[PDB]
Design a protein around this ligand. Sequence first.
Ligand code: ADP
Ligand code: ORN
Ligand code: MG
Length: 356
Amino acid sequence: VDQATLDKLEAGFKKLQEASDCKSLLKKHLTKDVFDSIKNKKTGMGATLLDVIQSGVENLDSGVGIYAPDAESYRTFGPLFDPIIDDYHGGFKLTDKHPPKQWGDINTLVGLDPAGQFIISTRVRCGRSLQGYPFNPCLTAEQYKEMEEKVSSTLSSMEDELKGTYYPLTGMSKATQQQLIDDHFLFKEGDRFLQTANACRYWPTGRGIFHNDAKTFLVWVNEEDHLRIISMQKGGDLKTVYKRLVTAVDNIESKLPFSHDDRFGFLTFCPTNLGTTMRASVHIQLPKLAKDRKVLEDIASKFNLQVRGTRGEHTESEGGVYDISNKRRLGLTEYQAVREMQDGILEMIKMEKAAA
Ligand SMILES: Nc1ncnc2c1ncn2[C@@H]1O[C@H](COP(=O)(O)OP(=O)(O)O)[C@@H](O)[C@H]1O
Ligand SMILES: NCCC[C@H](N)C(=O)O
Ligand SMILES: [Mg+2]
């Protein structure tokens, strides 16, 4: 670890300590002992603590503030990752291990809002990393291209409901890209948290989106994770949405080798996405309960749910439409994760109906 990087690290620790109004987990859990204990360590690919924490240092409004440049980073820098992971996922000790993959009994899921007055649309995503490839900050341009080839070729073999077309961002018209983002299908371009983590190098090389013609099944290639596998549609039919995701993941898993860890389950670039990697969300209106997004957030948290804006995390609600989803992804099964969203959303709707 070179002196120049230490200089940047030493200054960052100071800034975080000084940042009286910063509320991120990096600031909360990076003690001097923790800082000093791991700041001189390096992975086989050369990732340092600066690579891990830089996004959180520059963006003090981060909720978390760290990413893993490679798989080893999760352990090399364990003293920072471990307490943050334990904190975010609502309890996960050093000695704990994520449970085996388990979709559960899909037929037990219900319609989240039959009368149709609150929920606009429902979405479930997972993430996966390809074996033999490190996370974004350690990839070369050529590797982005190799991965894109592997994934796009694999998805050409999808059949029936899942059959579709791959659209590279390279060559995609600006008008088409903006509509796909505005309609909540395609990942946004230019995220400051990812950018400062050096996760977006060589953009847009190797990046793109696969989807079926109806756009109920989508796959993001080379954004935050190597793959994000997405099922979504209008309405509240979670059972159908979830079933389509399961079908897709089971079929894709048989074809492509994904990184899985005995302790952390499926590996991802952000520690919030470990384990099941699953984020099940609704776009929902709750005008009475949301009369102050800070009140909404306090209610949601007790149901282990997270509130995001209409265009995703770090955005505002528009027209009263909030994104509400399970917060926890690690230390519970896929079934348990999706049920927390279902259970929480059904009750919040009950509360909305009962509210004055
Ligand atoms: N329930 C939903 N219905 C429609 N679009 C959604 C829903 N939940 C999230 N989205 C969209 O997904 C995109 C990604 O947003 P982010 O907040 O980055 O989620 P993740 O990275 O976990 O998908 C954004 O355009 C957001 O609008
Ligand atoms: N994936 C959610 C984390 C986004 C950003 N690193 C933050 O800490 O807010
Ligand atoms: Mg995202």
